[PDB]
Amino acid sequence: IKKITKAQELIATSRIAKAQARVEAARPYAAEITNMLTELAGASALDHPLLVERKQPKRAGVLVVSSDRGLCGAYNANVLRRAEELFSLLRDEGKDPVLYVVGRKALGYFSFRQRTVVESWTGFSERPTYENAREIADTLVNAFMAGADDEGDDAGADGILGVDELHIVFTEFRSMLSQTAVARRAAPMEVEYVGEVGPRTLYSFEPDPETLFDALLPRYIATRVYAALLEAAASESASRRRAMKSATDNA
């Protein structure tokens, strides 16, 4: 037991190194796509359905990112407590949570709570790839779009009952010592008008800014979901390292 926990601690240290490397590798593309999105938003009309809040919100998708392995000490517990807080806030605002899950631990938790999970993805929590994030973001965005024509409890012309909001509840890797579960509204996105300062030479948009913005917003959402998954993987590795250190101390 003691030897196993010590070995797991060292392996978790190596995994933390790998996860931090992955986050750093992902950073440049995120920065560049954010810059392009800012340019297109400055050039295009800010009226995308992903960018406009639905009136009378009545459903909110929530993606809870958890781990597959339970050797992490309180990582899943903190994530699920934050998810419960977000559910309470959504109910207070009058919205029904529509639950999506990443990882088996949250699946078991919500199965015990007997809360229906619309869709779940498992098996990649430790080393998530961009394809998993793209699939998750595509499902979430499709659900968000399906909610445009929904009223009350009727799916409308879609035939699919969507959601009016998208939130992500994952563990943010603040540092090696601190990893805090956070809730982030992935959609609808708000517009933060920063002071203009760049404007001396115009960008050329092919074919036109509106279609470029239309195509790039879903990609931005997928990129942010991928970043959240990477942060969750790093946080899970850190918390597993801490849990194994504590177990070795106990043993």
Binding site: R81, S88, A183, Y193
Partner: peptide, 23 residues
């Protein structure tokens, strides 16, 4: 379970920066 509601301030919202004057 009646869990405490998350503070709306604590919730962080994704935003799209625009280098334009405020409307």
């Amino acid at each position: 379970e009646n869990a405490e509601a998350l503070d709306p301030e604590d919730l962080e919202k994704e935003s799209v920066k625009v280098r334009k004057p405020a409307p």
